[PDB]
Design an enzyme around this catalytic site. Sequence first.
Site, PDB file in Angstrom:
ATOM      1  CG  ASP A 225      -4.127   1.045  -3.786  1.00 56.26           C
ATOM      2  OD1 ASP A 225      -3.246   0.821  -2.881  1.00 56.26           O
ATOM      3  OD2 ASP A 225      -4.911   2.011  -3.674  1.00 56.26           O
TER       4      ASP A 225
ATOM      5  CG  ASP B   1      -2.004   1.097   1.227  1.00 48.36           C
ATOM      6  OD1 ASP B   1      -2.124   1.827   0.210  1.00 48.36           O
ATOM      7  OD2 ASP B   1      -2.722   1.275   2.228  1.00 48.36           O
TER       8      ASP B   1
ATOM      9  CD  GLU C  22      -4.874   6.085  -1.744  1.00 50.11           C
ATOM     10  OE1 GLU C  22      -4.274   6.119  -0.662  1.00 50.11           O
ATOM     11  OE2 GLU C  22      -5.806   5.263  -1.966  1.00 50.11           O
ATOM     12  CD  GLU C  23      -3.332   5.410   2.367  1.00 45.96           C
ATOM     13  OE1 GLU C  23      -4.510   5.466   2.838  1.00 45.96           O
ATOM     14  OE2 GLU C  23      -2.810   4.322   2.046  1.00 45.96           O
TER      15      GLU C  23
HETATM   16  C1  LIG Z   1     -10.657  -3.678   4.600  1.00 46.82           C
HETATM   17  O1  LIG Z   1     -11.534  -3.698   3.445  1.00 46.82           O
HETATM   18  C2  LIG Z   1     -12.099  -2.556   2.915  1.00 46.82           C
HETATM   19  C3  LIG Z   1     -12.119  -1.300   3.520  1.00 46.82           C
HETATM   20  C4  LIG Z   1     -12.748  -0.235   2.881  1.00 46.82           C
HETATM   21  C5  LIG Z   1     -13.314  -0.427   1.613  1.00 46.82           C
HETATM   22  N1  LIG Z   1     -13.916   0.581   0.973  1.00 46.82           N
HETATM   23  C6  LIG Z   1     -13.263   1.651   0.440  1.00 46.82           C
HETATM   24  S1  LIG Z   1     -14.148   2.976  -0.264  1.00 46.82           S
HETATM   25  N2  LIG Z   1     -11.911   1.736   0.574  1.00 46.82           N
HETATM   26  C7  LIG Z   1     -11.102   2.827   0.002  1.00 46.82           C
HETATM   27  C8  LIG Z   1      -9.663   2.490   0.308  1.00 46.82           C
HETATM   28  C9  LIG Z   1      -8.778   3.666  -0.110  1.00 46.82           C
HETATM   29  N3  LIG Z   1      -7.323   3.161   0.050  1.00 46.82           N
HETATM   30  C10 LIG Z   1      -6.617   2.388  -0.801  1.00 46.82           C
HETATM   31  C11 LIG Z   1      -5.455   2.133  -0.261  1.00 46.82           C
HETATM   32  N4  LIG Z   1      -5.390   2.717   0.961  1.00 46.82           N
HETATM   33  C12 LIG Z   1      -6.585   3.316   1.129  1.00 46.82           C
HETATM   34  C13 LIG Z   1     -13.314  -1.708   1.022  1.00 46.82           C
HETATM   35  C14 LIG Z   1     -12.699  -2.774   1.661  1.00 46.82           C
HETATM   36  O2  LIG Z   1     -12.570  -4.047   1.161  1.00 46.82           O
HETATM   37  C15 LIG Z   1     -13.213  -4.250  -0.094  1.00 46.82           C
HETATM   38 ZN   LIG Z   2      -3.931   2.797   2.269  1.00 47.03          ZN
END
Ligand SMILES: COc1ccc(NC(=S)NCCCn2ccnc2)cc1OC
Ligand SMILES: [Zn+2]
Length: 326
Positions: free
Chosen positions: A213, A125, A166-167
């Site tokens: 990602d 990540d 991004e974060e």
């Molecule tokens: C733990 O599982 C989840 C948690 C949240 C979401 N929903 C969203 S909208 N996440 C946006 C993540 C943005 N991001 C990408 C990398 N670091 C942050 C989905 C998940 O599993 C399908």
């Molecule tokens: Zn993240």
Amino acid sequence: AWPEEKNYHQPAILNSSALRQIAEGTSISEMWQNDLQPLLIERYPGSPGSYAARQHIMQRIQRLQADWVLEIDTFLSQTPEGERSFSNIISTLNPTAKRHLVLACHYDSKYFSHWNNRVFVGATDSAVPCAMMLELARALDKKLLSLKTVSDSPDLSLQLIFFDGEEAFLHWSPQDSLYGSRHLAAKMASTPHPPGARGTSQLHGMDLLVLLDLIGAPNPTFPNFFPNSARWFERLQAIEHELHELGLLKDHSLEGRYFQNYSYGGVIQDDHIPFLRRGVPVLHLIPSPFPEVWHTMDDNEENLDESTIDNLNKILQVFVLEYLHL
Ligand SMILES: COc1ccc(NC(=S)NCCCn2ccnc2)cc1OC
Ligand SMILES: [Zn+2]
Ligand SMILES: [Cl-]
């Protein structure tokens, strides 16, 4: 009509001997040491590591033979912690080509206060996605160098984007996330492409945004998120299947395959959003479920799976060559 060429664009599919060569041409150990390890550091915006991450990505691209043009898209934005500087890294082959296939990830790590003697380095990540893009550039260098050669026989090349910011700083919201991507999509939307054109912007130029990602955990499963990129996601399934059958993947079974037939019931926020909402087709290579380690101090090097990443490198490199007809 050139902005519609992407809707008709077909892969030039690699035969067996070409697939073997691609599989033999990528080095997971070289990636691990030269591309991945230096990024496994705290690298939130303005941190010493953000600067070092940025330098590392640039230097690695600079050493290659292909004609990569680098640009740092730096801007300021308010955040919950106060004003911060952000820098997207854009690495482009043939910047005046009307069309590009774009591969992307985020290079910033999420900010966490230190727990025990431990710091968050966002290995999946998205240090691994960065390293995969760098290894892709290196492994395909000789092939990509041929794009320097201008030919009658499409006006299409490759771009890499490493997004900053991004974060979320504090709590994910529309305003505290996606700082780099919301900025760059807005800029590209406002910028003529090709130079001098009427009507068309750099966003018309984006054939397809392949956003990596949360890559590096064992047994990932990727849903086929979007109907308008489903044919390309299907190519990834077929590449995976073919590499498997030829014995070119490691520790990989059909039952454990990565690229799935099903979609996802919800919307995942990430760097693709400001592009997707402006009509750019997106292939979002983020798994569901997310890695068990997600946003934990355990998202680290020990919990990465070498074979998985090496397999995904092979599949991505084949996809990119096929897309570009190389
Ligand atoms: C733990 O599982 C989840 C948690 C949240 C979401 N929903 C969203 S909208 N996440 C946006 C993540 C943005 N991001 C990408 C990398 N670091 C942050 C989905 C998940 O599993 C399908
Ligand atoms: Zn993240
Ligand atoms: Cl899930």
